[PDB]
Amino acid sequence: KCPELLQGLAHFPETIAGSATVAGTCVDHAVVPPGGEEPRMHCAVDGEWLVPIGQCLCQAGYEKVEDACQACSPGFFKFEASESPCLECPEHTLPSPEGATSCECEEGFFRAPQDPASMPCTLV
């Protein structure tokens, strides 16, 4: 049979082919990105997994380690569900707690209402 395989942050169960496209279930704290193709992979009668289409990604606040999604260490953030690691808190910010999506700005600092969360804070 085809082995139970964890690949692309998604679990693919052990499966037997048929004389065989199977979908993958996203792993804990990983999700399918909004406009993206869901994890699918093909099983072959010789016991081989073939042509992986699509992937899951670690959601905000989590990053990819081995083949799991793990919380951002305190001091780091990840605001989108991207292929990136956790990013260190930017200039003029305060150390974030675990699983952070952004870092709080420092007393006396702000980021304009337009600016994203991956941006340094500026003097008010």
Partner: antibody
Framework: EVQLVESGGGLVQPGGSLRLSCAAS????????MHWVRQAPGKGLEWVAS????????YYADSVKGRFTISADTSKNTAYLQMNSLRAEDTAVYYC????????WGQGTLVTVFN | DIQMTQSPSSLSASVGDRVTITCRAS??????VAWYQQKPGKAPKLLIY???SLYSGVPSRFSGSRSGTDFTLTISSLQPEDFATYYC????????????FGQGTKVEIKR
């Protein structure tokens, strides 16, 4: 395994110049801040310079500002510290470390300024 | 330049004891404080980050605490491998202010 291997330290005369390298394996220099921390013989750690390819900033301690230049080449995952107008107090072991809370350090390289 | 005053500069202790090194910052520095151990001839090792969080792999006997500006590192039962020198470092603002270190505490064996 994240690794930092430094090189370039050694003997140099005042006013001469020297360049230290920091080759990194196991992670991407672009996605990380890198810092240089020096230790004079018998003293504690002193910060020297910092670099973030991502946010694009190069920061120096007040005591070395304008004589050293920090740089990095994300292709070769290597950060450089160029030391110019070298003085007696610049004699120290120079370390490169990753992140502000520095979780991985290089082994160090010894810079000796001799008259 | 936020000064980091480390106390004490030296202490002698027996194996198993509770060691407590203190570091008072000149300003509010949030939790942007870290602790390192250096054995002679070797590079420092991160011990505690965000003033209270254990790095991965550091033995559980190490801990860090905050109250306002006074950060304290504590060793619950000193083991023989913990005879070394310790540094507090603050990194407040993640680069917006100079990274400054404590001056160090050397922990020696009582005899």
């Amino acid at each position: 395994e994240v690794q930092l291997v430094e090189s370039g330290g050694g003997l140099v005369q005042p006013g001469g110049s020297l360049r230290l390298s920091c080759a990194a394996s196991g992670f991407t220099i672009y996605y990380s801040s890198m810092h240089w921390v020096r230790q004079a013989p018998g003293k504690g750690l002193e910060w020297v310079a910092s670099i973030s390819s991502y946010y694009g900033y190069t920061y120096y301690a007040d005591s070395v500002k304008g004589r050293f230049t920090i740089s990095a080449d994300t292709s070769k995952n290597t950060a450089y510290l160029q030391m110019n107008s070298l003085r007696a107090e610049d004699t120290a072991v120079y370390y490169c470390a990753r992140y502000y809370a520095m979780d991985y350090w290089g082994q160090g390289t010894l810079v000796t300024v001799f008259n | 330049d936020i000064q980091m005053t480390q106390s004490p500069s030296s202490l002698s202790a027996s194996v198993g004891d509770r060691v407590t090194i203190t570091c008072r910052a000149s300003q509010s520095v949030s939790s942007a404080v870290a602790w390192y151990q250096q054995k002679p001839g070797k590079a420092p090792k991160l011990l505690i980050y965000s003033a209270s969080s254990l790095y991965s792999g550091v033995p559980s006997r190490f801990s860090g605490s905050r109250s306002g500006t006074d950060f304290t590192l504590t060793i619950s039962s000193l083991q023989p491998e913990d005879f070394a020198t310790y540094y507090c470092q603050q990194y407040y603002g993640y680069g917006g202010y100079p990274i400054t270190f404590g001056q160090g505490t050397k922990v020696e064996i009582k005899r």
